[PDB]
Amino acid sequence: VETISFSFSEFEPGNDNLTLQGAALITQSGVLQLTKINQNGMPAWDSTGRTLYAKPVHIWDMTTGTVASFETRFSFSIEQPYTRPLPADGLVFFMGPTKSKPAQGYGYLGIFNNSKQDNSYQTLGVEFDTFSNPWDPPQVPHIGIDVNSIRSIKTQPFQLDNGQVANVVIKYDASSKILHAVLVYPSSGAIYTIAEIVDVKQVLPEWVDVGLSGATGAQRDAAETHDVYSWSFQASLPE
Amino acid sequence: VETISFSFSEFEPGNDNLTLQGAALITQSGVLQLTKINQNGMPAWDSTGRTLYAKPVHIWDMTTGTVASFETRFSFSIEQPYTRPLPADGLVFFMGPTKSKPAQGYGYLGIFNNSKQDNSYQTLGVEFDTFSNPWDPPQVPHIGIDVNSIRSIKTQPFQLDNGQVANVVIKYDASSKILHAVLVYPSSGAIYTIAEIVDVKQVLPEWVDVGLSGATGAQRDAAETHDVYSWSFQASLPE
Ligand SMILES: *[C@@H]1O[C@H](CO)[C@@H](O[C@@H]2O[C@H](CO)[C@@H](O[C@@H]3O[C@H](CO[C@H]4O[C@H](CO)[C@@H](O)[C@H](O)[C@@H]4O)[C@@H](O)[C@H](O[C@H]4O[C@H](CO)[C@@H](O)[C@H](O)[C@@H]4O)[C@@H]3O[C@@H]3OC[C@@H](O)[C@H](O)[C@H]3O)[C@H](O)[C@H]2NC(C)=O)[C@H](O[C@@H]2O[C@@H](C)[C@@H](O)[C@@H](O)[C@@H]2O)[C@H]1NC(C)=O
Ligand SMILES: *[C@@H]1O[C@H](CO)[C@@H](O[C@@H]2O[C@H](CO)[C@@H](O[C@@H]3O[C@H](CO[C@H]4O[C@H](CO)[C@@H](O)[C@H](O)[C@@H]4O)[C@@H](O)[C@H](O[C@H]4O[C@H](CO)[C@@H](O)[C@H](O)[C@@H]4O)[C@@H]3O[C@@H]3OC[C@@H](O)[C@H](O)[C@H]3O)[C@H](O)[C@H]2NC(C)=O)[C@H](O[C@@H]2O[C@@H](C)[C@@H](O)[C@@H](O)[C@@H]2O)[C@H]1NC(C)=O
Ligand SMILES: OC[C@H]1O[C@@H](O[C@H]2[C@H](O)[C@@H](O)[C@H](O)O[C@@H]2CO)[C@H](O)[C@@H](O)[C@H]1O
Ligand SMILES: OC[C@H]1O[C@@H](O[C@H]2[C@H](O)[C@@H](O)[C@H](O)O[C@@H]2CO)[C@H](O)[C@@H](O)[C@H]1O
Ligand SMILES: [Ca+2]
Ligand SMILES: [Ca+2]
Ligand SMILES: [Mn+2]
Ligand SMILES: [Mn+2]
């Protein structure tokens, strides 16, 4: 059995186990700020940042046909300081091709280049979408399961607890092919759940990079924070 | 669309919307005690109690072949006062044939008569099992998805926060046939998730009674409390 795991109770600046891209930055206080925060302490618009674990993960094996079960947990907070314009764009946990660089920002969240469902993307993502694009349901924010497209195959709206820490648990059972995600706000006690069948062998390459990506809007002040406090991951390939 | 829903933020003694069976009782403080609590305030062993919503639920239609999606949420607390003997047996949320009466207690949790996987049971349940019977995994307590048998098709162990309130969310998406359950302990912040594919048309009758059942052990002091603080349910039959 091939197993890989990591656990960051907090982030340390200078750590070489994480690949920071775009605006991503680790503060001295141990927080991972996916998108830029100005000198005045306000979140900057037109910003995209990602963080990928420095080691590729063996998600499935073509020879044996076996696929890994995995689980990831993380805590984040989104703060929307302005009433207008509407805040944007959200953050996302994703798995895709190794050695990747940031894609389009804004509504594409740094992982897609358009709104097509293209198999060449080879990307699986669980989004926490704060802005309603034309391909999105009307309700925002919403959790979404993205399979080779920004147009989620399943969506679940949730109420944002402004500036409060949300706990996330995403689990994938290879046997049943069920990807189940949970969002909990300890502050309000709110619990949200979403699940859908996803056969990763049809989506992802055998080896993938796992990461988090965030993006702010396309116009002045259409922004919010995308701060991550901790992140752990574990995967087991029965092989 | 046939829709049914109910929400009990607390329980009122005398309410005629709930059918209490066995030891089940609603206290003046608004708590539903599934199993018996003695005069000395300790939980009694050899006790079984259930509570069923007074109206049957239309879960699926044979004619159109459509099946309902549903969601239930509830809060409970289990208190284990003794180090020995081991506490037992647990509680369970279930759906089964209408007009049913309590079955075998103990490890059968009041909903099964043996440990066979019998289609005539026509019962679907999500258990919170505190005692390890020969048909159970070694780890207790554990969440379990029961389909026509006390021998769960899927199990998820969890750590009991003695006497603390646990929040539960169980959701079923008829389209994907995914039954997903979540347990959260606000006290410790612990989150547990379990999911499995279940086609209810193969298990349940078209109309079912929904309820909660609890049971204490087969020997002196093999007991614990099974208190429920709130319970809501909603179901929608696209028809
Ligand atoms: C977070 O970042 C940490 C720092 O980068 C990670 O820890 C490093 O993990 C490396 C494993 O990839 C590990 O590398 C090995 O280092 C050996 C020498 O250092 C040890 O021994 C010294 C005395 O001999 C001692 O002074 C040190 O303090 C260490 O105890 C070295 O012998 C190994 O080389 C062998 O294996 C490689 C690979 O097959 C061969 O190339 C080599 O010929 C030899 O056979 C190995 O060296 C690394 O090899 C690859 C090369 O490119 C690297 O430059 C070279 O360093 C390294 O020791 C530790 N660093 C420390 C300070 O402990 C950490 O990884 C996790 O934790 C480690 C301990 C290990 O369990 C990993 O599997 C974990 O992933 C990162 N954490 C996470 C979650 O990613
Ligand atoms: C929790 O328990 C509550 C108390 O039992 C539930 O509320 C009851 O819900 C009953 C619906 O099943 C409802 O029954 C109807 O009562 C009508 C008369 O009472 C009303 O109007 C009076 C003045 O006319 C007024 O004084 C009262 O305060 C009420 O406002 C009556 O007209 C209805 O009869 C018609 O429909 C039935 C069914 O087709 C026919 O049989 C009948 O011929 C007529 O056409 C109906 O009466 C009930 O009919 C069935 C019979 O066996 C019953 O004995 C008879 O009562 C009842 O009024 C309320 N009670 C109160 C105090 O409001 C509650 O149900 C939920 O809430 C209600 C309001 C409704 O929305 C339900 O659909 C909900 O489920 C329970 N809550 C839950 C979550 O289960
Ligand atoms: O406002 C945030 C929102 O912007 C969308 O892009 C807009 C842009 O804001 C507007 O100034 C320009 O005229 O039209 C663009 C196209 O709609 C992004 O698409 C959306 O993701 C958010 O970033
Ligand atoms: O001890 C709680 C546990 O009892 C099991 O039943 C036992 C019983 O406790 C013991 O006194 C008797 O001799 O044998 C019984 C069969 O194992 C129940 O099966 C279990 O569910 C718990 O209730
Ligand atoms: Ca969007
Ligand atoms: Ca048991
Ligand atoms: Mn979206
Ligand atoms: Mn069990």
- Tokens 């060449």 found at: A120
Q: Which of B173, B184, B189 sits opposite A191 (nearest CB)?
A: B184
Assess whether the C-beta atom of B133 lies below 6 angstroms from ligand 4: yes
Q: Which ligand is nearest to the CA of B218?
A: 4
Extract the tokens encoding B115: 């440990």
Q: Which residues of B34-55 are buried (b: 16+ CB within 10 A; e: fewer)?
A: bbbbeeeebbbbbbbbbbbbee
Extract the tokens encoding B122: 């026509």
Nearest to A143 by CA among A118, A125, A121: A125
**CB count, 10 Å around CB of A92?**
27
For chain B, positions 164-183, list CB contacts with chain A under 8 A: 167, 169, 171, 173, 176, 178, 180, 182
Separation of CA B74 from chain center: 10
For chain B, list the strands marked E by DSSP: 2-8, 18-22, 25-26, 32-33, 48-53, 57-58, 69-77, 89-96, 124-129, 142-147, 154-157, 166-173, 178-185, 190-197, 207-216, 227-237
Separation of CA A217 from chain center: 17
Extract the tokens encoding A23: 């605006």
Q: CA A180, B175, A192 angle in degrees (round to 5)? A: 35
CA distance A151 to A112: 10
Nearest to B60 by CA among B210, B233, B199: B199
CA distance A68 to A2: 9
**CB count, 10 Å around CB of B113?**
11
Nearest to B34 by CA among B229, B227, B231: B227
Beta bridge partners of B28: none
From which experimental method does this structure derive?
X-ray
Radius of gyration of chain A (CA): 17
Nearest to A120 by CA among A149, A95, A146, A93: A149
Nearest to A103 by CA among A236, A211, A7: A211
Nearest to B123 by CA among B135, B115, B112: B112
Longest dimension (CA), chain A: 55
3-state secondary structure A34-78: CCCECCCCCECCCCEEEEEECCCEECECCCCCCECEEEEEEEEEC
Backbone angles phi, psi at B121, to 5 degrees: -65, -40
What range does the domain containing A201 cover?
A: 1-239
Backbone angles phi, psi at B62, to 5 degrees: -60, -40
**CB count, 10 Å around CB of B153?**
16
For chain A, positions 47-86, list CB contacts with chain B under 8 A: 73
CA distance A206 to A200: 9
Q: Does A189 touch chain B (CB under 8 A)?
A: yes
Interchain pair A189, B186: CB under 8 A? yes
Q: Are A181 and A209 in contact (CB under 8 A)?
A: no
Q: Which residues contact B204 (CB under 8 A, 6 or more apart)?
A: B59, B60, B95, B96, B122, B123, B124
Q: How many CA atoms lie within 13 A of A109 on its CB side?
A: 31
Q: Chain B partners of A73 at a C-beta cutoff of 8 Å? A: 191
Which resolution, in Å, applies to this structure? Answer: 2.0
Q: Which ligand is nearest to the CA of B133?
A: 6
Q: Which residues of A105-127 are buried (b: 16+ CB within 10 A; e: fewer)?
A: bbbbbbbbeebeeeeebebbbbb
The strand pair at A154-157 and A166-173 is best described as unpaired
Q: Are A86 and A222 in contact (CB under 8 A)?
A: yes
Q: Which residues contact B108 (CB under 8 A, 6 or more apart)?
A: B114, B115, B150, B215
Extract the tokens encoding A230: 């901790």
Nearest to B150 by CA among B94, B212, B223: B94
Beta bridge partners of B3: B236
CA distance B161 to A165: 22
Q: Which residues contact B32 (CB under 8 A, 6 or more apart)?
A: B11, B24, B25, B26, B51, B212, B227, B228, B229, B231
Distance A54 CA to ligand 7 centre (A): 27
CA distance B59 to B5: 13
Assess whether the C-beta atom of B17 lies below 6 angstroms from ligand 2: yes
Q: Does A153 touch chain B (CB under 8 A)?
A: no
Q: Which amino acid is at B87?
A: P
In three-state secondary structure terms, B108 is helix
CA distance B195 to B193: 7
Q: Which of A167, A184, A195 sits opposite B195 (nearest CB)?
A: A195
Q: What is the dihedral of CA B176, B153, B72, B27, to 10 degrees?
A: 170
CA distance A67 to A192: 27
Interchain pair A176, B182: CB under 8 A? no
Interchain pair B195, A178: CB under 8 A? yes
Nearest to B215 by CA among B106, B128, B133, B101: B106
CA distance A118 to A104: 15
Interchain pair A176, B169: CB under 8 A? no
Interface test with B, best of A193, A197, A198, A232 (most B CBs within 10 A): A193
Q: Does A9 touch chain B (CB under 8 A)?
A: no
Q: Does B44 touch chain A (CB under 8 A)?
A: no
Extract the tokens encoding B109: 């949790």
Q: Does B191 touch chain A (CB under 8 A)?
A: yes
Please spell the DSSP secondary structure of chain A, one letter per residue.
Answer: -EEEEEEESS--TT-SSEEEEET-EE-TTS-EESS-B-TTSPBPSS-EEEEEESS-EE-B-TTT--B-EEEEEEEEE-----SSS---EEEEEEEE-TT----B-GGGTTTBSSSS--GGG--EEEEEE-S--TTS-S-SSEEEEEESSSS-SEEEE----TT--EEEEEEEETTTTEEEEEEEETTTTEEEEEEEE--GGGTS-SEEEEEEEEEE-SSTT-----EEEEEEEEEEE--
Q: Are A181 and A195 in contact (CB under 8 A)?
A: yes
Instruction: Specify the CATH number for the domain of residue A68.
Output: 2.60.120.200
CA distance B187 to B77: 12
The strand pair at A48-53 and A57-58 is best described as unpaired
Extract the tokens encoding B231: 């319970």
Indicate the number of domains in chain B: 1
- Tokens 């309410």 found at: B15
Q: Are A119 and A174 in contact (CB under 8 A)?
A: no
Is the Cα dihedral A19, A25, A26, A32 positive or negative? negative
